Symmetry: C3
Subunit: 259 residues, 3 copies
């Protein structure tokens, strides 16, 4: 039997491919379990500093919850699955590792909410994203309403969520939902280059800045500045910040150890 | 005597036209009274699920407070009028019905604040929006500073409000203030199509998502996610969400009842 | 000896040029001291209503902290310098005077954080902005993470800060980081025209609107609307708002006194 993810590990960067092309890379409980374990692994040390998540094929990044498996699941199993999915999105945000969603096709439902929980997004020409829950009488249940509004603002969020329309790669780039647009056939080359541009920077500094950004939202200005300054004073105590000064003084690339 | 609004009712969608072309569709107390009653009516059941608001003619969406009537109003009457105007904007936001502003011309003052209180905006080629209060020594008094900043961010809000410049349809679309741009002569066709794309979705789900978006702003991430989840668990108790599942299983359009 | 700033005073508008081309207009303690005194001066009356800040030459707006002087400064002197820099950014925000950054070249570090603390930004073709701290193992220490995220949102902020890439003038304009793009050779003409469009408006109204925008961020909607209304009721008590009504009634330009 084949694992839910193909892992292409390249030292400080890994590429995780959802190996589910025939089921539109949907989130089964087994897929979710592997995803959670991968996140826990890269979150437990500073060996891995950026992860690219993508789906197999050219049709689906991730269709969301697996509706075949849903036919085997009672109400309480559905609720426990959605709880685990929310916890996994939050683990991605709280992780010191940076997460890049390489959107190779359609994202819907939980698959869109996965892309929104990532730090950065790259869109192939076939990328599409949708939160279509209101068509079926519910709302996004894995943070999609809040995470979309925080990223594109309330007007664009209402547009997508209340009309339940899909957004294509060009519009996703124009509104900042996609940070990069990749040419035909170069999705993972672009996503990997993005990861390279992150992991040459210091891992605790990247992590701390990531968390400062996310944790400052919803605070008034002075509270948010106080939060940033606590994190600045924390990072000054690291050994890596000294290596940064030494590398700058010695006109060489820094070699950071994650301490 | 003719009413302040022409109402073009089409079942789940209504078009309300401010019938005031000769006075630039300004907000008199009588116009405001009708507006409040219309909002209360569509907010009291789920019969009406989207409303398009527009102004008569091709020059003004809504010029704001009626300055002819202002000459008849004492200070205390001005204050009571602005209080009612604020309450009406808030009623639009709190309503389960979705509100689309079809901007057929210039919006200023309270007319801009009306457009900002709506859920979505469509701009005709002649659409213009301005908050020019600082030219006259005051600031927007119907929520315009907050509602603009929440929609386009602090830099663009400062630009418009501190310079008191008007923004045209093309720029409004580029910065997301207008969700759609309509071709010459097709404003209400575009706005109505937008309304159709909303009202085929489930009304309590649309409403709940609208409120989740608006109520999450200003909260830190975990508080906002907790708020979304309370609303998700609420919507699971509706009958319409079951119709959504049944329609999906039966490969047919859903027929939602608002329960 | 020449002052750290050249001041081109034109009544209600001043242009402050960092006179440091040979050191990339870096922030020494002496530069920072002059900057703080200039801000205190224009913040202490309503004589000056807009200030344009720019750097000498065509290469650097402001490179940030002066690394030559840093070689003479002990750890405690660095900490006191960064504290003063933060206080000066906050003074710019709290000032009733409007601040326009005319970005003539590269901004980095504290120089970028200065531009972000300003109310509005104009970019010359050579404008570049960067927060590259993570390359050296730290994070921005003068509010840059919060001020950038508040202006361009969390996805674009993470992109710039986590990759430590520089953004050019065209992209800065598209994402709203630059409010205006100036043609080759016309930076200060464009920035001055922007200042003129501010200072013909009433100074207490401009100030109050500026503060309403900044102070409302991080509040939930009703708290933010209550804050705006307190400021509206404050501004109604000014003499200038009466001059605004009189000028409008008399079809003439207002002449505001700052009271």
């Amino acid at each position: 039997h084949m694992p839910e993810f193909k892992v292409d590990a390249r030292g400080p960067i890994e590429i995780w491919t959802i190996d589910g092309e025939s089921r539109r890379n949907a989130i089964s409980r087994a897929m979710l379990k592997e995803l959670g374990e991968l996140v826990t692994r890269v979150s437990s040390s500073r060996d891995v500093r950026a992860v690219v998540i993508t789906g197999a094929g050219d049709k689906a990044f991730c269709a969301g919850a697996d509706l075949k498996e849903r036919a085997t699941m009672a109400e309480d199993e559905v609720r426990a699955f959605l709880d685990g999915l929310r916890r996994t999105f939050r683990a991605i945000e709280k992780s010191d590792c940076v997460f890049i969603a390489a959107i190779n096709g359609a994202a819907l439902g939980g698959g869109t909410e996965l892309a929104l929980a990532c730090d950065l997004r790259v869109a192939a020409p076939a990328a599409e994203l949708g939160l279509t829950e209101v068509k079926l009488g519910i709302i996004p249940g894995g943070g999609g309403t809040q995470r979309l509004a925080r990223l594109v603002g309330p007007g664009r969020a209402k547009d997508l969520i209340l009309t339940a329309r899909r957004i294509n790669a060009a519009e996703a780039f124009s509104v900042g939902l996609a940070n990069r647009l990749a040419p035909e056939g170069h999705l993972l080359a672009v996503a990997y280059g993005l990861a390279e541009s992150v992991v040459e920077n210091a891992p605790i500094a990247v992590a701390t800045a990531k968390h400062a950004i996310d944790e400052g939202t919803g605070l008034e200005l002075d509270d948010a500045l106080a939060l940033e300054l606590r994190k600045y004073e924390e990072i000054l105590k690291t050994e890596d910040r000294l290596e940064g000064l030494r590398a700058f003084a010695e006109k060489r690339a820094p070699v950071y150890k994650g301490r």
